[PDB]
């Protein structure tokens, strides 16, 4: 879905939405486009183990330095392991192969840390209704730049968390939408096609330009 996201972002950015004679950013808000999932907390322990994260439903995952992934569902027991070659297995904390003892122990340390020590990004957002029977998205990749951490989920979502002002973007190619969390923690969800038509403020337009560069870097 990165290509889809890029087509969506080229289209919006090409419209020059902050260069309208009358910007009506409010008219681009669409609560029906609120995401189901986003990254609420993360821990970069890539000096030793990898990057752990919490999604907004309280599930946790870790992308290990070896490019494998473990996901703990929010029942607190259902695990999914994703091998480097992409093979997926379902397991549980209560009944796991001993081969995964170490990685499960690491997950529980990331989980306990995030749970008790970090703020929950978007704790004021009621997520869109999804399906408890569908698989969780997992973190496909991430990187950091001078200004942000970039987080790409397996459902196509790209999340950009800016370090200095704590502003964040959640971009979804399925809803063709952007959630913007500002410096006060207020949030709004915009349909990209409505931004084409109505415009937006310079702050959001700049962040969407940045987003396009990030998605380009992800596709590469």
UniProtKB/Swiss-Prot annotation:
Outcome recorded upon mutating residue 166 to A: In pincer mutant; loss of centrosomal location and decreased interaction with phosphorylated CDC25C and BUB1
PTM statement from Swiss-Prot or TrEMBL: Ubiquitinated by the anaphase promoting complex/cyclosome (APC/C) in anaphase and following DNA damage, leading to its degradation by the proteasome. Ubiquitination is mediated via its interaction with FZR1/CDH1. Ubiquitination and subsequent degradation prevents entry into mitosis and is essential to maintain an efficient G2 DNA damage checkpoint.
Location of the POLO box domain: 38-116, 138-220
Residues with Phosphothreonine modification: 126
Induction annotation: By growth-stimulating agents.
Tissue specificity remark: Placenta and colon.
Region (Important for interaction with phosphorylated proteins): 166-168
Cellular localisation: Nucleus; Chromosome, Centromere, Kinetochore; Cytoplasm, Cytoskeleton, Microtubule organizing center, Centrosome; Cytoplasm, Cytoskeleton, Spindle
Modified residues (Phosphoserine): 3, 78
Annotated effect of mutating residue 43 to A: Loss of centrosomal localization and of S-phase progression
Position(s), cross-link Glycyl lysine isopeptide (Lys-Gly) (interchain with G-Cter in ubiquitin): 120
Effect seen on changing residue 168 to M: In pincer mutant; loss of centrosomal location and decreased interaction with phosphorylated CDC25C and BUB1
Region (Linker) residue spans: 121-135
Domain of life from the UniProt record: Eukaryota
Family: Belongs to the protein kinase superfamily. Ser/Thr protein kinase family. CDC5/Polo subfamily.
Function in brief: Serine/threonine-protein kinase that performs several important functions throughout M phase of the cell cycle, including the regulation of centrosome maturation and spindle assembly, the removal of cohesins from chromosome arms, the inactivation of anaphase-promoting complex/cyclosome (APC/C) inhibitors, and the regulation of mitotic exit and cytokinesis. Polo-like kinase proteins act by binding and phosphorylating proteins that are already phosphorylated on a specific motif recognized by the POLO box domains.
Quaternary structure and partners: Interacts with CEP170. Interacts with EVI5. Interacts with FAM29A. Interacts with SLX4/BTBD12. Interacts with TTDN1. Interacts (via POLO-box domain) with the phosphorylated form of BUB1, CDC25C and CENPU. Interacts with KIF2A. Interacts with CYLD. Part of an astrin (SPAG5)-kinastrin (SKAP) complex containing KNSTRN, SPAG5, PLK1, DYNLL1 and SGO2. Interacts with BIRC6/bruce. Interacts with CDK1-phosphorylated FRY; this interaction occurs in mitotic cells, but not in interphase cells. FRY interaction facilitates AURKA-mediated PLK1 phosphorylation.
Disease: Defects in PLK1 are associated with some cancers, such as gastric, thyroid or B-cell lymphomas. Expression is cancer increased in tumor tissues with a poor prognosis, suggesting a role in malignant transformations and carcinogenesis.
Free-text comment about domains: The POLO box domains act as phosphopeptide-binding module that recognizes and binds serine-[phosphothreonine/phosphoserine]-(proline/X) motifs. PLK1 recognizes and binds docking proteins that are already phosphorylated on these motifs, and then phosphorylates them. PLK1 can also create its own docking sites by mediating phosphorylation of serine-[phosphothreonine/phosphoserine]-(proline/X) motifs subsequently recognized by the POLO box domains.
This protein's name: Serine/threonine-protein kinase PLK1
Annotated source species: Homo sapiens (Human)
Parent sequence residues shown: 373 to 592 of 603
């Amino acid at each position: 879905h990165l290509s889809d996201m890029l087509q969506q972002l080229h289209s919006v950015n090409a419209s020059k939405p902050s260069e309208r004679g009358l910007v009506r950013q409010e008219e681009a808000e669409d609560p029906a486009c609120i995401p189901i999932f986003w990254v609420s907390k993360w821990v970069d322990y890539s000096d030793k183990y990898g990057l752990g994260y919490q999604l907004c439903d309280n599930s946790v995952g870790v992308l290990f330095n070896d490019s494998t992934r473990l996901i703990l569902y929010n029942d607190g027991d259902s695990l999914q392991y994703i091998e480097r070659d992409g093979t997926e297995s379902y397991l549980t904390v209560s009944s796991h192969p001993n081969s995964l003892m170490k990685k499960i122990t690491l997950l529980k340390y990331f989980r306990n840390y995030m749970s008790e020590h970090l703020l929950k990004a978007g704790a004021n957002i009621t997520p869109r209704e999804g399906d408890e029977l569908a698989r969780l998205p997992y973190l496909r990749t991430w990187f950091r730049t001078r200004s942000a951490i970039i987080l790409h989920l397996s459902n196509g979502s790209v999340q950009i968390n800016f370090f200095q002002d704590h502003t964040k973007l959640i971009l979804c190619p399925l809803m063709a939408a952007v959630t913007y969390i500002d410096e006060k923690r207020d949030f709004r969800t915009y349909r990209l096609s409505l931004l084409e038509e109505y415009g937006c403020c310079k702050e959001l337009a700049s962040r969407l330009r940045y987003a396009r560069t990030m998605v380009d870097k992800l596709l590469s």
